[PDB]
Design a protein around this ligand. Structure first.
Ligand SMILES: Nc1ncnc2c1ncn2[C@@H]1O[C@H](COP(=O)(O)OP(=O)(O)OP(=O)(O)O)[C@@H](O)[C@H]1O
Ligand SMILES: Nc1ncnc2c1ncn2[C@@H]1O[C@H](COP(=O)(O)OP(=O)(O)OP(=O)(O)O)[C@@H](O)[C@H]1O
Ligand SMILES: CN1[C@@H](CSCC(F)(F)F)Nc2cc(Cl)c(S(N)(=O)=O)cc2S1(=O)=O
Ligand SMILES: CN1[C@@H](CSCC(F)(F)F)Nc2cc(Cl)c(S(N)(=O)=O)cc2S1(=O)=O
Lengths: 846, 847, 29
């Protein structure tokens, strides 16, 4: 009580050979041999079999790299190039299959109609004959297909046996001495001179050109994917697909090469068909090899006006054989087997395509009925399409379009083997080793050259329909993640250039601002991701750091899920940033890890962007110590610092994503800069790079500072320049008392004692301030509140204010004093405020 | 010395007008009007300026979006579709211009030569006159263009005045009553019965069909990018480029529409040209229309063999003029202007490509060229190509592929606007009143349709040569940064797993063996990062430290190894390795395997070093790493010109790679040898795989293992089974293990776990005997497996055993190191101990 | 569970037992 699975002979080889053998073998191959001669016909066959051999090797390498399921061709292409190029070629493969059902039932019906005219009486109408017969035949084929998959595989064997019987009949017939009405039509039994004179071309008519023969034959050698299309019923598709496909191609090619060279050595190109053309002694003259055998076709050859022979009579292969009705049976089998093999493939590819939710509302047809889960709804859709194209019944101009839907699949079956083999993902491990990627690119190019040679305006329609669906799938972005080779091309494309960076040494004319941004969870502080992603996009590096403060010291898998959530959040905003997190016991010791290790060779951060600690006056005085220690560590590691503040705050935690200030047009406002120390040029570069952006390009960069000589020489292009007024002068008293009573809870009331005893008493906590430093660094303390007054005077209603970050000497001043300066310097201002100081490096050399 | 800037009426509108106007205006348009009639010619003109106006709208939309430089056209295709279409289309667009220079100077050359045949005496054959004069004309244009673009604007203004006097001459000559000589050739003044006679087509000839007329005219209406390629020389492009480009189109279309009607309202289609055809009163009956004016043109119209008239004489508009030579002056202006516009617009694009750093294929630019940065090298390249194609002198065969190199650019320029509009690309917000993404998609459909309609095989070479350039470049800082950030979208699959190593070398030149080994199989495949921990105080970027860190990168580069160097500072090795594990890498390119060397003399150094060494592995297992430990017989540290040579630089030959797959770790034990065997040195080796099994299930599970190894497509040759691992080892080997573990033995008698910590805090590496009893079976397994390995793999090339794993708090460091040293002792080839992280790295399936 | 497993086919299939995790083999008991 298990579903049946097929071997390789009965499952791949028989079906591929039945699909390849059509009606060209019977009704137009002798004609091609007569027109083009044996040698050039052999060239045509061996030239049309090169393309299908190359595609067989490609589809055979692709299908032995894992386990294959239902879906056949579509499954193999989509899982190897992804849904964009896989779901656009799996919707026209099925449609082309359905129309192929239509165009082979039409041929079967035409043969039946031609049989019925002569023997008895034709029915209803010449053209309304090919409608009735085709519709009834497709209904019968639908029934036999819909009855199960062990009954169709019993019909295909019957058709194969019928074809073999026709071949044996023809070979037996071509070996008996010719009867009198048999030789009057051209057929002499076997010789040498007919062979010799049939070796060279004899073109006639408007259709008799070499390319006019290649155009007729080539679409009759494709059809090799009829066994790979039932890959869900084979019991070992990793051994059944290569052997079956390649053996089928070999055997059908031998069949063609034998039929042509055997028909061309028996029947002469010109014969009359009248039993009275026997040669009369002593009269006139011969016109050819015929008169040596006693027959006289001179009037034909002189007038070019008779019906029989290897050119003029299309059904010569019926006349030659011992019993023509068996050749008729062969034609019936050859035409019905292809229709059945197309009807099955359309449904089994469409069901797989509908399982994967790639297109809006065709998912109704991806349902299985029964134990084997046959697509009882795909069969009926293909039947409806085939009956619709059979009612038309004149498909002589539809065929060029359909035959180019099958050459877009040959061009993507071959590119999928080239692309996946030049990449070498570990895991790209096929067990069919007899292929080459350059011979697979060759086939991809030729399948597109031929598609235009055959007819240039149907290739245009085919490629237009391919791109329409390709673009739809790109713009909808479904989520599948099948691990294609396009996804593995990105990694080694990135690695090849990251390793390439090493070759170029460190210079001074390639400075870039590469930022390490201390965000925490990017959700919490978006106003600090936007500011940095404004001026580093498409120019330099930015990393969004994060320290997980806990004592766990183990990297649980759940942390990688969280790091995938934050990366996706960054990707929604279209920020070009990297996320990285570490684990430490406090915040100061995680940023040390990030500064020391992060980056890749030459692409490593050299600027530290950190928010401002708003609540430093109501937190434990040991956290401000860590906060100032971070800045001191950044200075020791030879970084540049940028402390950023806002009036309302940075942490937003204390659906849609949040919107901040740095996302909107800020036209007609000024960007104020207060240059107080030659840091090298970082205080000037950040607003210079910020103002070039469109959102900030309508702003007036104002610089408040020999200086004009130093400014214009770097061609920065700033609007104004000024001299700040008298920073030395004493500020008014109320602000000064505010400064002194702000720093009061760090007072010590120590009077004056020797440094030894002072340190003996400070040993517990270093953040407390003694009166010695207070009275020793009171001047520059006043200077900060004075300059805050100045800034609050000029920059009251600006759009972005940049000042210079002071440095407090280690050991000579505590951290509380430095944080008090940093506070009072930028308080009670409305716009965003930044405080930059570089690392004494020439950065304006660009 | 401020750079010169141009307005909209002299740097865009005039400069596009001159490029649109060619020689079809003077030699072919009257013929089109004669054949297709007035109405259908108007249809052709409007139907072919629809496309150019749509592309003008897209270019105008691009111009009002930020600021771009001169030659920065491809820069949207580059931004919106990747920098391999951007650069490729830019290269194609510049080459097409360079060829257009030659194809216009040849028209000027032909005009001058045919003028020479009439008046004076030609001095050479009529095919080397074209060559001998085209080169001189192009050289003169190169001189007056290399002079500076101030001396090119003046020439383009002179050329405009010349055309405007040719129009004045032609328009004056059609209001004057027809002279006896002129009227014999078919010229009559404005009369209504000629207007109504020419309103309908009169097709004749091989290419006298509507498609033939469209195919002659349409490539005479393009050239609307002549002023948009110099966006770096305009005063304010966002206001000058739309207003100028969209009025050049309008006024040239007006001129084309006016000439056709005015010329068709004057001249009959057929005429004789001999003054004998004055009518004879009373001589039968007339035939034709001119017989109402005094002229009989019957004999031609019956025999169809005269030479003049609007249908047979191409120069019919040079005779209706008041003075003939002014029309040839118009010809000279019309050809030399387009030749100059193309020469400037190709130099701009070449110089922009040579300045582009996301397209490092062209480059070729060294020292700066010119005080004003004139694109001197771009000019020389364009001049070279133009001369090379002049020397050919036959170009009607090359015309229909150079004319599709432009419609490829039109199609992609139009499609990138639609793409960037519909994907809501950040940085594309064009502030232009009349831009529609649908109207820009239509202009990209139509451009390709026309491209393939004009001639299909030439449109296939044009697409084919773009894809060769696209594929050739797929197979510095701004390119590495743009691809690394592109990995943030592609999401990981087990089918694409890559082993990304973090190699602990030290100074890379102390341990060449590790570097060579790990650079064998990660080469062109995955990441590897050399590591180095400078044990000591903390401080950084000392001028010396960076200069040291550059020397080791130079050493890695000389040896031809694709690796990164990374040094951190800590107080001991363990903390430095933790710092390196947690934070090294960039995004998805971060290590997930840690490879170290073997502690050669772990029995002589202080045991705290052994404790830290084993702690390194214990931490690697805590961060989800796979661990490889590499042991070599002589040692890895070479310290204890020329670069030293290791055994991993020689071809190994036909020797074997024995793998001992004991515990299932995911597949890393047997993915390293596979990748190792994809290389030249190891490509002849034989992979033998050993597994454990039972006596009386031997073949039944050998077959199962062989079936498993062939679902993975690994291609491993042998498979053996070891059924005697649970035996007892020989006596002296167990005695050696027990003596080699003696110094670390606690020797505490037998006490409970509560008090063992009491005397083991001082030395946490010591082994309590209650704890050495519970590990006797596993301890003897290592000796037995060592005997097996010596028995089999004595003469192999590389040996792989799985790493035993020890629980925290259940096995001390000394015991673990004793196992690691027992498993791989007294054995000649390199030994590697691998342990994956218990996750699958191999797969059967496709999804 | 907690004991290291010799190679089997059952760990690599899809649909019966689970390969021990790295934390199960390494963390304390
Ligand atoms: N866990 C963390 N990881 C990384 N960076 C952090 C972390 N915590 C804080 N920072 C950085 O240090 C800055 C100052 O820390 P602090 O906790 O004072 O900010 P905050 O109090 O969250 O800001 P707000 O006043 O807006 O709440 C933060 O703005 C942030 O830039
Ligand atoms: N300063 C260092 N930085 C980075 N890695 C190191 C450093 N020192 C040692 N290692 C790595 O740790 C391993 C431990 O070996 P250790 O240095 O303790 O003894 P060794 O005999 O010097 O090592 P080897 O056998 O490699 O010479 C070494 O093999 C090496 O790979
Ligand atoms: C003869 N066929 C040609 C198309 S040219 C004849 C024309 F269509 F024009 F009539 N190519 C294929 C290819 C495949 Cl792959 C399959 S199938 N069943 O494997 O999927 C079937 C066919 S075919 O039978 O339609
Ligand atoms: C008259 N030209 C036609 C091509 S007609 C066929 C041919 F002559 F090429 F054989 N198309 C363009 C388009 C542009 Cl956009 C530019 S330009 N100056 O912007 O670069 C120049 C030209 S043209 O001068 O070559």
């Amino acid at each position: 009580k298990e579903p049946v699975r097929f071997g390789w002979v009965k499952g791949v080889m028989i079906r591929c050979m039945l699909n390849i053998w059509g009606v060209i073998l019977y009704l137009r191959l002798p004609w091609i041999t007569a027109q083009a001669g044996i040698v050039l016909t052999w060239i045509i066959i061996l030239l049309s079999v090169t393309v299908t051999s190359i595609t067989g090797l490609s589809i055979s390498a692709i299908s032995t790299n894992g386990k294959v399921k239902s879906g056949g061709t579509y499954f193999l292409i989509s899982r190897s190039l992804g849904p964009e190029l896989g779901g656009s070629i799996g919707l026209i493969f099925a449609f082309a299959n359905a129309v192929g059902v239509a165009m082979h039932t039409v041929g079967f019906a035409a043969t039946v109609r031609d049989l019925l005219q002569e023997y008895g009486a034709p029915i209803v109408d010449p053209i309304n004959d090919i409608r009735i017969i085709g519709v009834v035949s497709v209904t019968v084929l639908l029934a036999i297909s819909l009855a199960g998959m062990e009954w169709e595989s019993k019909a295909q064997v019957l058709f194969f046996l019928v074809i073999m019987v026709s071949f044996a009949n023809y070979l037996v017939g071509t070996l008996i001495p010719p009867s009198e009405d048999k030789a009057s039509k051209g057929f002499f039994s076997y010789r040498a001179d007919i062979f010799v004179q049939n070796l060279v071309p004899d073109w006639r008519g408007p259709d008799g050109t070499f390319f006019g023969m290649f155009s007729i034959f080539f679409p009759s050698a494709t059809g090799i994917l009829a066994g790979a299309n039932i890959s869900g019923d084979l019991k070992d598709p990793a051994i059944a697909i290569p052997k079956g496909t390649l053996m089928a191609i070999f055997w059908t090619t031998i069949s063609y090469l034998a039929i042509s060279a055997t028909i061309g050595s028996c029947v002469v190109r010109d014969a009359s068909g009248v039993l009275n053309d026997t040669v009369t002694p002593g009269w006139g003259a011969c016109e050819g090899l015929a008169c040596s055998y006693g027959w006289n076709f001179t009037e034909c050859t002189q007038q070019h006006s008779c019906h029989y022979g290897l050119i003029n009579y299309y059904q010569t292969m019926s006349m030659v054989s011992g019993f023509a009705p068996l050749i008729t049976a062969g034609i019936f089998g050859a035409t019905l087997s292809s229709a059945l093999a197309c009807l099955v493939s359309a449904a089994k590819v469409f069901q797989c395509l509908c399982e994967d939710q790639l297109y809006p509302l065709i998912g109704f047809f991806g349902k299985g009925y029964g134990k084997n889960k046959e697509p009882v709804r795909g069969y009926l859709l293909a039947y409806a399409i085939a009956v619709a194209f059979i009612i038309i019944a004149e498909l002589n101009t539809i065929a060029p379009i359909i035959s180019n839907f099958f050459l877009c699949s040959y061009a993507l079956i071959n590119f999928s083997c080239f692309h996946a083999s030049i990449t070498n993902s570990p895991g790209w491990r096929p067990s069919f080793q007899y292929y080459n990627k350059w011979a697979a690119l060759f086939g991809a190019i030729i399948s597109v050259v031929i598609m235009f040679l055959l007819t240039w305006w149907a290739a245009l329609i085919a490629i237009g329909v391919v791109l329409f669906l390709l673009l739809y799938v790109i713009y909808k972005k479904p989520e599948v993640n099948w691990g294609s080779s396009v996804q593995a091309g990105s990694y080694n494309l990135a690695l090849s250039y990251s390793v390439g960076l090493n070759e170029v040494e460190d210079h001074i004319k390639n400075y870039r601002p590469q930022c390490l941004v201390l965000t925490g969870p990017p959700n919490f502080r978006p106003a600090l991701v936007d500011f940095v992603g404004t001026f580093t996009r498409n120019l330099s590096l930015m990393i969004c750091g994060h320290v997980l403060i806990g004592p766990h010291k183990q990297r649980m898998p759940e942390l990688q899920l969280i790091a995938n959530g934050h990366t996706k959040w960054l990707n929604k905003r279209k920020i070009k940033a990297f996320y990285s997190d570490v684990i430490a016991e406090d915040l100061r010791r995680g940023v040390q890890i990030l500064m020391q290790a992060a980056g890749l060779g030459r692409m490593k951060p050299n600027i530290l962007v950190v928010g401002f600690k708003k609540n430093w006056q109501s937190a434990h005085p040991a956290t401000v110590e860590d906060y100032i220690g971070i800045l001191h560590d950044a200075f020791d590691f030879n970084y540049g610092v940028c402390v950023m503040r806002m009036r309302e705050g940075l942490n937003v935690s204390k659906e849609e994503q949040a919107t901040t200030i740095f996302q909107s047009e800020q036209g007609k406002k000024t960007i104020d800069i207060y240059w107080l120390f030659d840091d090298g040029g970082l205080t000037l570069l950040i607003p210079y790079l910020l103002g070039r952006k469109r959102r900030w390009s309508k702003c007036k960069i104002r610089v408040f500072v020999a200086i004009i000589s130093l400014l214009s020489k770097f061609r920065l292009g700033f609007h104004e320049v000024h001299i700040l007024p008298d920073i030395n002068q004493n500020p008014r008293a109320e602000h000064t008392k505010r400064f002194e009573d702000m720093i009061a809870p760090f007072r010590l009331n120590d009077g004056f004692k020797d440094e030894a005893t002072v340190n003996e008493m400070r040993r517990d906590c270093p953040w407390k301030i003694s009166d010695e430093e207070i009275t020793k660094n009171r001047v520059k303390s006043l200077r900060q509140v004075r300059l805050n007054e100045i800034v609050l005077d000029y920059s009251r209603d600006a759009a972005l204010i940049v000042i210079t970050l002071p440095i407090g000497r280690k050991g000579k001043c505590p951290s509380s004093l430095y944080m008090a300066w940093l506070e009072t310097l930028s308080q009670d201002l409305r716009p965003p405020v930044i405080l930059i100081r570089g690392n004494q490096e020439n950065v304006l050399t660009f």
